[PDB]
Design a binder for this molecule. Structure first.
Ligand SMILES: [Cu+2]
Ligand SMILES: [Cu+2]
Ligand SMILES: [Pt+2]
Ligand SMILES: [Pt+2]
Lengths: 75, 68
């Protein structure tokens, strides 16, 4: 499993993080997601034969938050 | 045509997401009331797609009818 860091503009309060967190977590292949208001991003651990940094990016973008890929990490 | 939806909007950031999914569907002119948790869309798009657009927010939406 790999790790992507998508930066996210437009998170203001916790309802925002929660919303983003609780539905991108429902997504399959997503092992783990942790969204941060402070540096305004999400970190996702994920099963790579299920999702790609672009599929996860687009999932967030379709929610009305502007998501752009910052860091891919893996082996 | 002026349809009217209920969208649970907690924060101001929640309301910014509604105007984005709307702006990307295009061909709408909207006004989002954050206190009253309501959206009105004037659009030739079908009620069913305008509905479908607004639940991409993750927020529970619902159709109240027309104004118009
Ligand atoms: Cu918020
Ligand atoms: Cu919000
Ligand atoms: Pt808030
Ligand atoms: Pt109106």
């Amino acid at each position: 499993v790999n790790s992507v860091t998508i930066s996210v503009e437009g998170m203001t309060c916790n309802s925002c993080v929660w919303t983003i967190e609780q539905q991108i977590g429902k997504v399959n292949g997503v092992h783990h997601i942790k969204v941060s208001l402070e540096e305004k991003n999400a970190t996702i651990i994920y099963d790579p034969k299920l999702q790609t940094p672009k599929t996860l990016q687009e999932a967030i973008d379709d929610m009305g938050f502007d998501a752009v890929i910052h860091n891919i990490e893996g082996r | 045509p002026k349809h009217e939806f209920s969208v649970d909007m907690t924060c101001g950031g929640c309301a910014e997401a509604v105007s984005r999914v709307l702006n990307k569907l295009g061909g709408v002119k909207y006004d989002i009331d954050l206190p009253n948790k309501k959206v009105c869309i004037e659009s030739e798009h079908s009620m069913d797609t305008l509905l479908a657009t607004l639940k991409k927010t993750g927020k529970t939406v619902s159709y109240l009818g027309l104004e118009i």
